């Protein structure tokens, strides 16, 4: 481990990298333009045991047509990009 004390600002530059991970993610899978919105709450908690919860919702147009997983791609790749993330400090 070689970061610092993880209050709000440690644990929103997290949130915020987390949050970035799924809306890249999301738009290297279908388009910003064919998107209606996004909504992505990140959260993170500390209770003797370190909590990480990531909630997004993808909100296509009334006529655009993508993937039966294309926002669970997008959790999972910020999850597994987390876990590999912190290879980079507990291995």
Not at 15 to 20: C, G, Q
Not at 24 to 51: G, M, N, Q, W
Not at 55 to 78: F, K, N
Request: charged share 35%; hydrophobic share 40%.
């Amino acid at each position: 481990m070689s970061l610092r004390k993880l209050t709000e600002g440690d644990l929103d530059e997290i949130s915020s990298f987390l949050h970035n991970t799924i809306s890249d993610f999301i738009l290297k899978r279908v388009s910003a333009k064919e998107i209606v919105d996004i909504d992505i709450t990140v959260l993170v908690e500390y209770t003797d045991e370190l909590k990480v919860d990531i909630s997004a919702e993808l909100y296509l147009d009334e006529l655009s047509d993508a993937d039966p997983g294309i926002v669970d791609e997008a959790v999972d790749a910020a999850y597994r990009s987390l876990e590999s993330f912190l290879d980079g400090f507990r291995e």
